[PDB]
Symmetry: D2
Subunit: 116 residues, 4 copies
Amino acid sequence: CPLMVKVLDAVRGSPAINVAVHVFRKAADDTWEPFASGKTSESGELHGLTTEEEFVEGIYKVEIDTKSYWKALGISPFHEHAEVVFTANDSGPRRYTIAALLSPYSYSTTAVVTNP
Amino acid sequence: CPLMVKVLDAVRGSPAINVAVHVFRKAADDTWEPFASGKTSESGELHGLTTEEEFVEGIYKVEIDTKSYWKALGISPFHEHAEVVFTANDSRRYTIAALLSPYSYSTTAVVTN
Amino acid sequence: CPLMVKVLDAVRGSPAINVAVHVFRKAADDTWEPFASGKTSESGELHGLTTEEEFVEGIYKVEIDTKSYWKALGISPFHEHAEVVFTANDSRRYTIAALLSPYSYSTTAVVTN
Amino acid sequence: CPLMVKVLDAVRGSPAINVAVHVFRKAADDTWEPFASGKTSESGELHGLTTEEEFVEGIYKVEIDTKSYWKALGISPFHEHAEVVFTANDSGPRRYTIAALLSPYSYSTTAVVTNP
Ligand SMILES: Oc1ccc(/C=C/c2cc(O)cc(O)c2)cc1
Ligand SMILES: Oc1ccc(/C=C/c2cc(O)cc(O)c2)cc1
Ligand code: NA
Ligand code: NA
């Protein structure tokens, strides 16, 4: 799988477990088409969203449902979600790790892009 | 003005100047309606986007054109843009700050008196 | 004043108020000599730490007392403090910003005219 | 090993490879005693710094040599190093991951603390 999402909690110093993630891909008509979804594991990781074959060139949006995560812990957070929008595989196939570090009123995201 | 946007560059240690910023408000049909826009100043700040009267409760999106910023410096960036999506709640000043790198960004909200 | 420190709270979305900040300068014997200190204001800022005359080239450390800040909110934090260590170079205004969470912090430098 | 250090590069979107790391522990006389050191691998990770037996209660400092890392890539960075100072194992043994995300004029650090 060439796409992995990793989420960390900066309040608890832990993986962010059971975080919903929705991935969208921009269609030829400029709409966001559902691409894949899942939720983070006990390690804060979400593996197996897609395959090398399915993960073609395109503009992708990874939506991390931060608000639902914080509400479940009794915190009323600032953001609706964290959205990561990027062009993928435009110089051929790459592996992407999208990491997010969450606080109630802030988040940080980074990408690690590797060439198999 | 109850909304200010501040953009910083983590590579050069400077304000991010002349960055396009677009603000949208979510409509009843779940589409994003253009609300306000501008370019960051020499201080990396964008003031005067809206008024207390116009800035009613609702879901807003701040889109920062990070890709054009990095391309203008000759740096190949990861993201198409940085998006900050939040609910304005009357329960009164919002500063949306973003700290930019080519493959990463950090955003915070400073919500005060 | 060529040095300003700004501290923000990522949990509450607010300035970090009444945070102790200590600045040190590295001496010839590699020890840290006290240089300036204060507490962040209601805006999370600490101004007037030094002067252009005093703030000569050298290695400085800004120590932010994050542990006392979180303990005062009833939150158990990870770090003893946040330390920012940098060289001042005359080749002229330095803002050291820190964004605090209980188990994390982000720091940036904004170095301008 | 109950201590792992992970370093990421926010300019290149990659692990930060060959980053020197020095760990110190506060002695009874309030000095920083050398505890362990090493450098990040091709994955940006540094494993095997210590053992459960050796990693006793104490105040530890993890110094990440960011300046040497950036200078090696032709960037003149702002910070001398990134220092992470924390009390460890004061409620019994824990596993600590210290992560740092680096830019020339900025860094972010977080801890992931797990109970074996
Ligand atoms: O990770 C980070 C994300 C955001 C920030 C904000 C810093 C900052 C600095 C200023 O001088 C004014 C301001 O309104 C904000 C810092 C770090
Ligand atoms: O501001 C930030 C600070 C730290 C991080 C960490 C990301 C990360 C990604 C991994 O694959 C493993 C890991 O241990 C950590 C992300 C953002
Ligand atoms: Na191509
Ligand atoms: Na104890």
